[PDB]
Design a protein around this ligand. Structure first.
Ligand SMILES: Cc1cc2nc3c(=O)[nH]c(=O)nc-3n(C[C@H](O)[C@H](O)[C@H](O)COP(=O)(O)O)c2cc1C
Ligand SMILES: Cc1cc2nc3c(=O)[nH]c(=O)nc-3n(C[C@H](O)[C@H](O)[C@H](O)COP(=O)(O)O)c2cc1C
Ligand SMILES: [Fe+3]
Ligand SMILES: [Fe+3]
Ligand SMILES: [Fe+3]
Ligand SMILES: [Fe+3]
Lengths: 403, 403
């Protein structure tokens, strides 16, 4: 198959897979993604860093073969697996079949995870690596940095010394599938918004670990050596500090003044409330986003939560409970643990017809999920003008609090 | 607008609205529904029992006018509101405008509810009615029976007792939009499955109150000669015992041997488990339904839950939580309180890549939701043959236990 490697540096090639078609990946919406694998060709040896999702071997291999042709090398000598998830290890068995002499470099935990996914690999040779271990390729060296929980127990980064390229696995990734490989080659908005969505959905709960790893990267003296970050999805950063800074901002709760209003409704009263809350918040000059759960994906909602100092979450009561769609978001939030960056303020609200109970339930679940629920607005059925005014005031107050 | 009424009884006419296009109604999927309103004419007065959704006055009125002309009458004299929800009260303001002399008969609670939805009814004449209260139309008499929590605090039934006709509001309803108005005019499977879905989604938590309300009709001696149940949605029961018996079964946990297996997955492992569980259960000869939360509506899942003595709920772990779709289904199950018909047995399962957590949480949440969670199959990444055999056995045991 005809698929070209893309040169990133002398002897460093993107040889990944363009998944134009993927639209939902573990309840993350996207418009395609990529599975970036890299071929690092030293004078002596060739390493493949990561691979790709099952069934994409033909593409990865076509690009690998192109890159080997370009550097005039014969084979991949070392298979590096920064992470075991199947979008990055899904053709490992096929790569092991193609390059039977290539040891697989990965963390110890990764070996276990790989073997569980691919029991036939028991026969393969694994080189377990820990932080600071080095693979010498001849004029190119790869230094491994274990990155447990960033985003998986098996994860590591691989730093190409000399080129200063940090192969960061999913970290700094973005789910974008562009024919352009570099950050600077696409609109900055799209790049950063995808980076943002990726952090919000995948990195938020790891935020404290990400800061700790950055400290470590700096302590080990690696930070100053990073000229490029080449993640496992999306664009390669020729401006690594842009994404480091953004990750530090995101990990530390740096936000512009913004309220995200999220609601669902059966009969529309909670929607009227949500608009009034949004109007109120807008009145204080903060940015405002409004999401309806019936329509909007949790992955986009949490993207804006990342950049919001407060949220408002609304739902009617159905048989003493919140409308169940908030259950999905709230479970997702419980996992993301936004409090790990910033304990965001929350307003809970909703219409009800009887004893209510949605806002209380939501308040409890938001607490569990690391939000500071200061206020609640609850309306019996259809909000009166006064009640809608009170919702505006609630949103104004919420916005004023995060100013 | 041309729209004909339907004579369903002597001086009792159907004058409702066909909502062909509705697909999703407060998180209940349907293929349209009806807002059944009935023109009960006697010797003196004409009650409109319930009405229809906002923006459908032209259709309703057209049928009421066509009914009045079929009975040779001038006006609706009484606007009966068994229930305040907007699908049955959404043209009440317009009815009050068209029939300003008609008082509105409803429960005391319904007045507060109606007034909140439609403030302009502050001027309206309300006649509040309680259990045992009557409305003589001449020679035809309506009886009210409060049915708080069936399904709302405002709800009641209107009885044309002596004719054995029950206007049951939502009770016994089904979300069906057919040209045919009667139970016996459409396929029994469709009728009963829509009635089943309706019970599962709306009635389940009210099961005990349903049984108690049957008892109260019986004690009030009103039950005696049931000939028609005319609900707010869907088909009119010319065979009311069919649905009464079905409700009694549903309320009392009468099930055939059936396991419903429900799962979500990111990379397919939990799906493999779900299949093996389903296979195990099938080996015991019981009926098995398998739903995927990414694909399937909670309203359909719970329709099967109602007809199942056991369920299996599976999901992978994401940042220490169940995959979030299960948060929606659980929050829904929590409102439905299936344990009020039968404490069904449940198996939780799922794949995980580190510490797991989802099955434990799902165990906790399902038990809060009214299930007897008989254990837990958690697999690290991809199941081995033995692990799948273990899932088979878990489903077999689940099934065997419900035989
Ligand atoms: C199936 C159903 C069940 C409901 N159960 C409750 C309940 O248990 N408690 C309550 O206060 N309201 C209950 N409600 C009433 C709604 O909460 C009320 O209609 C509210 O105004 C709806 O808000 P919304 O317009 O944003 O959907 C229920 C409504 C429906 C659709
Ligand atoms: C975003 C992400 C976060 C994850 N977090 C956890 C975790 O917190 N604990 C755990 O045990 N596994 C975690 N996993 C690992 C998955 O549970 C594991 O891949 C599992 O085998 C997925 O099962 P599935 O194939 O049914 O989707 C995570 C996976 C992803 C994609
Ligand atoms: Fe990953
Ligand atoms: Fe990835
Ligand atoms: Fe209703
Ligand atoms: Fe209804």
């Amino acid at each position: 198959m005809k698929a070209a490697a893309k040169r990133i540096s002398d002897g460093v090639y993107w040889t990944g897979v363009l998944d134009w078609d993927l639209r939902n990946y573990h309840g993350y919406t996207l418009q395609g993604t990529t599975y970036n694998a890299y071929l690092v060709c030293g004078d002596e040896g060739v390493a493949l860093i990561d691979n790709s999702y099952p069934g994409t071997f033909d593409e990865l291999m076509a690009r690998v073969e192109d890159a080997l042709q370009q550097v005039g090398m014969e084979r991949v000598d070392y298979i590096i697996q920064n992470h075991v998830e199947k979008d990055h290890s899904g053709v490992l068995v096929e790569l092991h079949r193609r390059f039977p002499e290539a040891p697989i470099y990965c963390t110890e935990v990764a070996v276990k995870g790989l073997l569980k996914h691919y029991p036939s690999l028991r026969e393969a040779e694994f080189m377990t690596v820990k932080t600071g271990d080095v693979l010498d390729l001849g004029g190119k060296t790869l230094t491994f940095l274990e990155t447990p929980l960033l985003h998986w127990p098996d994860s590591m980064f691989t730093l190409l010394d000399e080129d200063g390229i940090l192969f960061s696995n999913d970290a700094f990734g973005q789910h974008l599938c562009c024919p352009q490989r570099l950050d600077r080659e696409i609109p900055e908005y799209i790049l950063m918004d995808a980076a943002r969505k990726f952090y919000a959905n995948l990195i938020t709960p790891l935020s404290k670990l990400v800061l700790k790893k950055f400290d470590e990267v700096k302590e080990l003296g690696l930070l100053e050596r990073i000229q490029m970050i080449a993640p496992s999805h999306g664009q390669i950063w020729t401006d690594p500090m842009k994404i480091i800074e953004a990750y530090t901002g995101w990990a530390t709760g740096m936000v512009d003044e913004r309220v995200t209003v999220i609601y669902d409704t059966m009969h529309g009263s909670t929607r009227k409330m949500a608009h009034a809350i949004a109007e109120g918040a807008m009145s204080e000059g903060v940015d405002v986003r409004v999401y309806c759960l019936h329509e909007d994906d949790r992955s986009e909602i949490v993207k804006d939560i990342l950049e919001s100092g407060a949220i408002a979450l609304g739902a009617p009561t159905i048989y003493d409970e919140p409308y169940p769609s908030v259950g999905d978001l709230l479970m997702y939030l419980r996992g993301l643990k936004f409090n790990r960056t910033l304990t965001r303020k929350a307003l809970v609200f909703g219409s009800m017809g009887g004893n209510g109970g949605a806002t209380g339930t939501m308040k409890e679940l938001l607490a569990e999920a690391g939000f500071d629920v200061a206020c609640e607005e609850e309306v019996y059925y259809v909000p009166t003008g006064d009640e809608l005014d009170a919702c505006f005031e609630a949103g104004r107050k919420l916005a004023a609090e995060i100013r």
